[PDB]
Symmetry: D2
Subunit: 258 residues, 4 copies
């Protein structure tokens, strides 16, 4: 079985300190769960918040420098998201995996900018996109030179201010890329979020079969500057990870062949 990916970290780079605190914990779990490839995630810019008054971040320069500290202090791989083509090059200096936001999954130039860096690229599936329509997204990355591609399931528009997770997307997308399940954005209520469903839905994802999971986690979610109602309390991370590795193991012999 392939090394399972767990992408995790605070939603936003609130400070270099917050980063070091989560990083410390992620490093501890990586030493325990040696069958997992851990990737530390945090955004240097929440460029698509609903409100002009909401927290965005401290800028690209500061964020890359704080992620670089996490990588240097803990030896952890790094992923962060870009919003315009010009950011691909500077971010690629620290990011092992460049993330493409869900609203931007069809922006050709942004995808090509990420792909020519030589870094892996993970595209969040747009809330508007059918799972079979990710085939062209992967084709655009492969055309642009990307050799390691991920597609992340994060819910689909289901009426107003609600997302539903159609688990059929996991085996469908697996036909053309590795698949990541985003356990924290899939339960958000666009323009909101329900923490009580994070755990059940992530159990469903590993029972269906995916190649990794993505989770935002913060020492104190209620105090977070972004995604306060969906970020997972840091102390709860180890137990969630153990549970998914257990459920994955027992379901794995039944995963179907693409």
């Amino acid at each position: 079985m392939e090394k399972f990916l767990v992408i995790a970290g605070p939603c936003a780079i609130e400070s270099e300190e917050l980063l070091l605190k989560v990083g410390e914990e992620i490093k501890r779990l990586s030493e325990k769960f040696k069958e997992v490839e851990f990737v530390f995630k945090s955004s240097f810019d929440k460029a698509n918040r609903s409100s002009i008054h909401s927290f965005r971040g401290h800028g690209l320069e500061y964020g890359v420098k704080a992620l670089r500290k996490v990588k240097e202090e803990f030896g952890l791989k790094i992923t962060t998201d870009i919003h315009e083509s010009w950011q691909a090059e500077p971010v690629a200096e620290v990011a092992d995996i460049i993330q493409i936001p869900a609203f931007l999954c069809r922006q050709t130039d942004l995808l090509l900018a990420a792909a020519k860096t030589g870094r892996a690229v993970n595209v969040k599936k747009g809330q508007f996109l059918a799972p079979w329509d990710t085939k062209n997204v992967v084709e655009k990355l492969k055309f642009g030179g990307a050799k390691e591609i991920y597609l992340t399931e994060r819910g689909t528009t289901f009426g107003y201010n609600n997302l539903v997770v159609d688990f059929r997307s996991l085996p469908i997308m697996k036909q053309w890329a590795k698949v990541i399940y985003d356990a924290t954005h899939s339960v958000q209520l666009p323009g909101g979020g329900m923490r009580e469903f994070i755990f059940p839905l992530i159990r469903a994802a590993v029972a269906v079969g995916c190649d990794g999971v993505f989770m935002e986690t913060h020492p104190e979610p209620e105090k977070a500057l972004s995604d306060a109602s969906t970020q997972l309390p840091l102390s709860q991370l180890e137990g969630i990870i153990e549970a998914i590795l257990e459920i994955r193991e027992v379901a794995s012999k039944y995963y179907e062949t693409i």
Copy 2:
């Protein structure tokens, strides 16, 4: 209480077919003692899209064939009703009376079912939000029902498509035992066999009280739900798989 597996051919195509399927379910029944098996088949497909499609052989012949399965194999029975008058005659043989998803809000049908003293399983309508099943349960309690089940079978997602919102499992559990219907949840109304097993794995990882699966020795030849009925020979493997997943996952099912 023990995990429920409700299984059988979609339609009572013949007393014979029920006996063949009944035999295999009897067999699995002896192999998996911790599971409560309930044999299912419909005496009438009362809501087919086309007037030219197979409906069945009538309630009399159907109850007779189901009686034969219960007598011959000792299996509990479940079938669905479509109008209030059918509840009492079906209750002579059915341990569980099933309410069709389009009929989940028909007050008299629910009350007629509750009045028989039998257990009632209501398929959640494709139009119903999970929190709105609380009133469904309340109707049945008011009607005297004491063993109540709610079955997840997908929700309307645009035209000719259903999506399973797994958040409904924990929500519905606040007021009834919850069953996951593995075969209708992937059908395309007005489906895809390849998604049956993956989604049933999800349902037990999330946590449910039972699973519902239509099965037929030769699905391609079935007269109803031909595209989604599970081949009978695959049933054992899927049941063992979900008992294994449940065993591990149950440690994590959230309290009520």
Copy 3:
């Protein structure tokens, strides 16, 4: 141009008196709007309420007798809905148009029970049904002997507790039956309702093109026993009808040919 249909009346037969009061007003409008075919509607049983504690009605016998009074006192056509096959025969004694509830639009026996009465049949399109899938519904009625058939647009499931009206359904369904737009149920919030959208959406319906409209109306909606937030104040009916006849007239030369 065909005589436009306006189906209207109180949601439920709260009393024979309420019926006579609305009937009086509908009769007055029928004398004014002679280009409209008016049909008086009221249910003898709200058989599918969400709550066991909600108002259902005073029974079939009482309801048919109250509708028969309206027909006899005002000379108005009558429509009411059935819920089980056995009710088709007694209701057909008074109802010119037998209505099939939206949740029951695929119940074969109920449709055949209505069709063999020789009365017109109007089927509410299920909130789960695609517009092209009404073709088989009409085929079932024609097979059962119905010679005058209507399909009513009343919204489609759009996430939880919300309905959306896809106006493309009007020209699609028109391929096989006369089409009615239900102005009051289309704005209800299943398991709720928004009165402010009734008027705009009914203007859209006649600009697209339909063969009639359906509206629930009560002298005092807030006091209604069913659909209190969507029933139209009776005093507002005349002005709505004048507006739709005006918009219909001006749009009509552009209605496309089926």
Copy 4:
């Protein structure tokens, strides 16, 4: 203020095509003096599903061709931007800067557009509820924009389908002028020409401040939105139709 009609070929396939279309719009412009016509064409289809599809001839060539239309015919101009840097160069020719629907929440793009001093039209995202456009308008006001439009273009309805919820027209009007996009609202993402005219009739019966329509002398030969671009010759008839409907219906538009 007067009713807006924004029209033109989806993509700047060539300075020529724009001139042919510009000529017809100039003509209608003289025929319908109460209407403010705005000529539209995209210099880059930056979000095509396939890497092998037509994107265009670049921003430079595009701004040049649009400048030619404004110089030659005196028509106001609108085109869309895809990244913040494009706002200032596009603002030399565009009276209205268009924000793509997938990019309606990208704060910097909205701010870059507002900073040019031009009017801004934001296509409402297929994922956005109508009440959630209030924050979109607030971003643009904060950015200095004073003439703001919100365009209805359909909402995600299951997979590969959009539905127009007309309730959004009156809701969005509380905070901006509202335009109805008649051609993308009926496209099937990842459409149907037969529904364009019926839905545009609905939009003016409900009440909007303008309509948006892509038009091409020969849609079948277009390099983008070939399935939905309106044949140029049909444009006059549809504009006269909607002015007639609006004239009658406007008596009933609800206050703000």
